[PDB]
Symmetry: C3
Subunit: 334 residues, 3 copies
Amino acid sequence: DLKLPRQKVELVAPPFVHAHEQATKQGPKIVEFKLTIEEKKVVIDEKGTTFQAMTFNGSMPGPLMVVHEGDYVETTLVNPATNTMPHNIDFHSATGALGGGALTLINPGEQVVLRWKATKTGVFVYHCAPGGPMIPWHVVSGMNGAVMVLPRDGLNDGKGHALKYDKVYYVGEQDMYVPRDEKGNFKSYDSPGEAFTDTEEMMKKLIPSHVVFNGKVGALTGKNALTANVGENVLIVHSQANRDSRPHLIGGHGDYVWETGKFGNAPEVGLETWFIRGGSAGAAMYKFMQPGIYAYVTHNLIEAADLGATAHFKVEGKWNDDLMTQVKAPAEIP
Amino acid sequence: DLKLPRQKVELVAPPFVHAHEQATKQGPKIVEFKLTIEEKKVVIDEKGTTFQAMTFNGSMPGPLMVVHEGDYVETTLVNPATNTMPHNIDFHSATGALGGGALTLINPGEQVVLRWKATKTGVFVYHCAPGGPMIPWHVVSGMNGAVMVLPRDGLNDGKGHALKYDKVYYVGEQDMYVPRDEKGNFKSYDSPGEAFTDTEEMMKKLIPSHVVFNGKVGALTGKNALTANVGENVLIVHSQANRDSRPHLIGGHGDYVWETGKFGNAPEVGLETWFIRGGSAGAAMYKFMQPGIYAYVTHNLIEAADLGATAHFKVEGKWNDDLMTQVKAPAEIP
Amino acid sequence: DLKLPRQKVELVAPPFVHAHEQATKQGPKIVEFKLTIEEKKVVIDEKGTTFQAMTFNGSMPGPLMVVHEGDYVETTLVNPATNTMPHNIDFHSATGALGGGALTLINPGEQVVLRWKATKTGVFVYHCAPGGPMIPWHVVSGMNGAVMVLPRDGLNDGKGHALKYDKVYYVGEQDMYVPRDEKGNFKSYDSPGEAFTDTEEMMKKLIPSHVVFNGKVGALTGKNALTANVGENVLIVHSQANRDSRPHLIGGHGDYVWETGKFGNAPEVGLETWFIRGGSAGAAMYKFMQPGIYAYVTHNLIEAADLGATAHFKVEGKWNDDLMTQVKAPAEIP
Ligand SMILES: OC[C@H]1O[C@](O)(CO)[C@@H](O)[C@@H]1O
Ligand SMILES: OC[C@H]1O[C@](O)(CO)[C@@H](O)[C@@H]1O
Ligand SMILES: OC[C@H]1O[C@](O)(CO)[C@@H](O)[C@@H]1O
Ligand SMILES: [Cu+2]
Ligand SMILES: [Cu+2]
Ligand SMILES: [Cu+2]
Ligand SMILES: [Cu+2]
Ligand SMILES: [Cu+2]
Ligand SMILES: [Cu+2]
């Protein structure tokens, strides 16, 4: 019945974001996405700890989907027969049927096609939610991502002025619960099912073993640091499907921040640290002013430095001595 | 000295809310409430775990009190001789004397009458606070509720438009700390006093055993699911007197949300998940658009699914295929 | 190159704040501060528990620095040879070089001079951040404080009206991690280095042993209670460099609150409880209306009453029976 043009999107793995328009002259379309579920054992830290992950499209987080207000988002969710568990998808951006979860439960070997109208603007979590205790377990195993629903006129500052980003990154934060043996080493498991009992026991104690960005300690560092140049306005979408976070750009700010993540609200300005409620996505824009290394963290510094939740930006450009300068280098106290 | 009309309220148990006006032509009144404290052993989960509760009016949470700005709230607090402990009441809505706590300490067999002027609008916690370590213990044993102070012109959107709810529910969330024995089973105690040492030891470790709505796992499900019809605007007041929460309506949104809970501030719009600071009440309005089951959770999904913090709505009406549709039911992958 | 007038500040220990102007006719200056690092063993509770602290200027928190928008803040950071560790300073108010940390690493026996331009208004954390796992450890050992960057026109309500405070207090909240021995007593250590292994093991479990204001249980009580008179507008700056908090003034309100702490945003009004994200400072103003004792807490009441996080105000003036009155003192139930 719905006679609108169809547009396919080629999703890309986080922290990158598929190409899209901010402000657009397009009217509503049916925007087509495919997500293929993958259960897989992965390495989550530099010590070689393994983890029974379950993912949309092979990544933690799942990829960012980007549409505009009033689009219809038509997702083909695929659960190949090489997986062991049923799965589904719930979009916090969608209205009805538990966000879609009640319409998308698929066994291994099945696929389903869900469409929802993007009536709410902002960034939103999506996640698997099979039912009952499986809900938290699938989410904390990695089955969560986000979708961005942009206004057709692009983003604004709440005072009539356009905010336009030069690039966007998606940082998905994952709380992980890896049990330890008697002597204190992390355990490894042969299947998600085998990991479940120990993993649920730990989950209910509410303390993660690892808190990571992009699926792994150090994922967004080194060759895979985020990048910018002085003068570029960067949008950083941050999601956390299960547990609170407090993002902070070390050496920078949130120039414009939607911590509750919803573009019908004006951004806050000039923040040091913002707050992502567990079960949500938020977004912050910053115009880089100084070159060099930045760390992007959750500002529980124990989780940042010790449990995995640090990304880097490497920023090119000219140092601004007006903004900051080392007046006297380290020297012996007189 | 205060020569204003008096109005009695018949309180009703949560999640229901006593009848009241939103916008009103009444001027200030003395609104009379009675709260009778009850210490009692209750069952908190479907396994039969027991808990030494202490309550206002027999319920967790205590009942919602509703008045208007500039009313005087006159509460008769009763501590029958069948209780074992002193108790008092502190209203976060009130000014002075530790919210009233310093004027309301009553031993078993006593009652006291406190009046406070409702000079601040919003939803607010009330709770017992005897002194010292008894403060957290009485609160986490159940001795907390909330009061709503409405503007005389009713609620507004911050842009000049009335928001009127068709019904209101009060969801009180309770963090509970039930110790376990050596073999791992929850303990039972003969009195609140007998429970105290083990319970305080656990409390100080900051991890609840249970996180429940309306006093029990599953309280707001089944016959006691919350209800609505498509087209109804529902206000959901959420309180948490001791510990943060992140409410979320699965399949819906917060159309208008006061997460800090205070009507002198405009609501935020179109939220997925909001945040109730421990020690506060907040409120969210949603106009239902789709029929069916919704879950209302804290979106730490471990606490929602595994520790008790899930309510349901059952919503009647016509399915809207424009907003969401199952384009293709589950089928074998081609 | 920077040819502006220089002004020295004499810092004062928290919770007091060095003298400053709110609205000012001064233009930009170079405002000079000195911070001298002190590692020291201190007592943190009334039981005599000790703690290996590391501090700016000898205090937890470090002292509040106050400047105006567009000032240049020139800090001489001194690490005397009587300390054991390298240290640095990162200002969340500053732009570049990890907030200054990348320009200020100093060994014992060294000092360094950093200048940054105060381009963002609000209250902000500063803290040590040497690198890697040392970052959280130095912060949770006490090496954090805050800086306030005021608009040159002073504070406003977002509706065109000046807010002027009669006094300001700085409450620095510290999460502390003191390990216990087998029999359950807190451990004591001979040096910060000796404390590190046990302390890091505990840190990674994310549960503090103590949560204190001004460095110690009960620091802001008794002779050192905070004070006010009825009619005085008091600004309370609250910081937490590592972990969330939920401030609340028991018996009062936050009349005007910047919980994210940044003066480019309007305050919220009439709050019961607000939220300080770990890694940030926020601020609340209240005009006292009633005399007597108030408690200022984090409203996780377990942390407030049992882990250390309670301050008092003692307020002088006349009781207002219109706002609150004890209609009937405790009496036998009829
Ligand atoms: O940026 C979004 C905000 O901007 C406005 O459209 C103009 O102030 C508001 O109505 C909205 O909340
Ligand atoms: O809804 C409450 C809000 O609405 C207004 O009255 C009009 O914008 C504001 O002054 C207030 O903060
Ligand atoms: O108080 C700060 C706020 O006040 C205003 O200047 C006037 O409403 C806003 O532009 C700013 O966000
Ligand atoms: Cu799944
Ligand atoms: Cu969800
Ligand atoms: Cu009590
Ligand atoms: Cu309280
Ligand atoms: Cu240091
Ligand atoms: Cu920092």
